[model samples]
Target chain A: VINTFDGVADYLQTYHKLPDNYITKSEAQALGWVASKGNLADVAPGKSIGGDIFSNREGKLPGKSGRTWREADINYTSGFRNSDRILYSSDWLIYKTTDHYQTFTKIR
Target chain B: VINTFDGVADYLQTYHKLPDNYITKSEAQALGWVASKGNLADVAPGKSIGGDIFSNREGKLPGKSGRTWREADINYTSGFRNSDRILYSSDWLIYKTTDHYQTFTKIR
Candidate 1:
């Protein structure tokens, strides 16, 4: 269904529920990053699989299950809109094979 | 005592081991990627932490722990020298804080 913030914004505004953009952007980036990693390897460069990046960001959401793609984006985006500056931007490259890795794609 | 492939080569050569380059290169990249992730958040896109990229590369090593950084070096290198072409390269940016992410450092 609705993926990007722009898509969600329409629903939120129509319902008189303005989603925060800061968290929204971060959530999208996190989801994209996680999916891309699965598409590439499985985990981070040095950590174990199935770790807790999501849980760590859980408390920062706009509502319960805050780390869900929806909440994180709102908090992150809201914070940014209000100039809170707590969102982090990182990146990872995916690969189908040795010479077939994707180029840098920012998860911001 | 050693990290990068170049560093390990110096040690192996004097011991009459003559480590291969491709595997070693890949191993170094793998280790660096792993280490960096742990030092930062952990894991990759869509996946949780503690997953295994090592297992998939297990049979590729020069020994039982074939995927061990040391063994992967020799096989990948020898294979490359022999023209097998299977080493993959990808990257991730590490961050200590929301605004403190590291710049890109190519693993290979």
Candidate 2:
């Protein structure tokens, strides 16, 4: 698997798998990701995707007891990130939304 | 006017004003509140409602930059609280969900 940005997202969306290059935001931060920029090559080489701490402020998803959600971004090969992303929780809940969280489709 | 739980919620919904009894969770915590029980009269003394952090892990609400969301319990007058809650953000966004966040009606 080449694991390109789109390829990885497709893998996550289609085959329902996180690529080997995936890393949590804290892991990236541990390596020195200030989030002011998104280059991430030296800090987390070959790890273009990150997920952590998505506080659902808008109440657009189902709420459950003692569950926290995290998110992953797409097309992060350069400067500022895009809108399309995946949101999942600690309880193994996965949702996909293309409109920057305006709506969601329960995937798992 | 009697400021019952519903009454206060009505007032907040109609006049867009929080009752004098409303307090933040931190304030209530300083007064000695434990979420395992809901008898807040002694510790909070006359404060019936409290506002605090609502982790929106479900991603059901609109996502915005630099915004935090909050939630308030409804009819929390005794042992164990009701599922009904009012969710709002620091940005003057208020939403009411009678079914415990199953669905939301945007209010201001």
Candidate 3:
């Protein structure tokens, strides 16, 4: 099920968290994340997408819950990001950005 | 003046407002944005990137200011889609999603 962008969002929504596959940017970097190269497993062992603090300064999404936000990369098994991602918070708001944040579609 | 993703961030930071070119999503949709086809000018006149409300539900971003977020598409001219977007808030938290929100690099 983790084969598509929607699949990733569903996983996050159901678990209220990211899957065990995600790593932090620093972790990936330590493993040698070469944008020039690509793919987590290629560099690091047994890693999927990485995590980072998503600054929702754009207010494109609703924050009436007054909560913060976090995001992680998705579908990066093959180098060259697949342009799929999930953003969620303690408030349990889960959203997906399919077009690289050109627009985010709410999954939860 | 906005030639690159960083340039967009600088524009937002310096002006504290999206340029007059940005339009809301519905605005573009009204002119018929099929997603199957792309580019604002092809479907609508005097339009650039569209706007949307970014709901910082993930807590991946810092919301200490307790403000909201908004975002718009960027570099979508020839429209195979260039994976560049900007997220900003009233408090002025401007961020750039270069890899399609898989991870966001904070320019501000």
Candidate 4:
């Protein structure tokens, strides 16, 4: 329910993407879509950010119908489970906590 | 020179590969090849065990020539480097230390 969004712009800097990476609302949403549920380590500070397209096949469109629920649904054992997401992030810059992720709002 | 082979068998239980995921020698070696360099996390406890086949495009055939030295060849900022691997594990059982990975033997 992404009730808030503060530093999404910063989190977007740790990786490389097209001219749009985080330049626009759409691209930001898309990358957020994929990173929405994976270990920050895989694509963390200086590790392997993004694999070659051919190597990474978990293709998910940003504002699609199927992905409506967001990976914020699955009971993941690790990576990013039903918890932890930008759903209502206020400081995507360095991972902050608020009301224990109590409230959230949707953008679209 | 993987001079040791104490528990390579158990370090390979936390995954969902195929029948040969770790049966024959080549299978063990191949799977070991990948697990060798990646974080015990990516394929650890539960997390994203393995991405959909389509999602994983870094295909390196075992015993191949290019991957010869193993990722044990890069300046990893986080993930495993050329230093950590079963190359000479004494306890693939739980990650022990020996003269700081002092001795090792190659199986091939």
In terms of TM-score, which candidate is strongest?
3
CA deviation > 4 Å runs, candidate 2: A1-108, B1-38
TM-score of chain A of each: 0.17, 0.54, 0.56, 0.16
- Model 3, TM vs. native: 0.32
- Model 1 chain B lDDT-worst window of ten: B71-80
The sequence of per-residue lDDT tens digits that candidate 4 reaches over residues B23-81 is: 22233233321222245432442232221111112432123332222112223232333
- Winner on TM-score between 2 and 3 is 3
How well is each residue in B1-108 modelled by candidate 3, as lDDT tens digits? Answer: 232233433444466443343333344344443223334443543456656787778755568666888778786643345678798877887888887666677887
Q: Name the 10 consecutive residues with the lowest summed lDDT in model 2 chain A.
A: A1-10
Which CAPRI level is candidate 2?
A: incorrect
Write down the lDDT that model 1 would get: 0.26
- lDDT digits (tens) for residues B1-108 of candidate 1: 232323433433354332232122234345442222221112222222222133324332233322332101112211011211222212322111121112222233
Top-down lDDT ranking: 2, 3, 1, 4
- Report the CAPRI category for model 4: incorrect
| Model 3: lDDT of residue B41 | 47
Sort candidate 3 into its docking category.
incorrect
iRMS (Å) per candidate: 17.7, 22.3, 15.8, 18.9
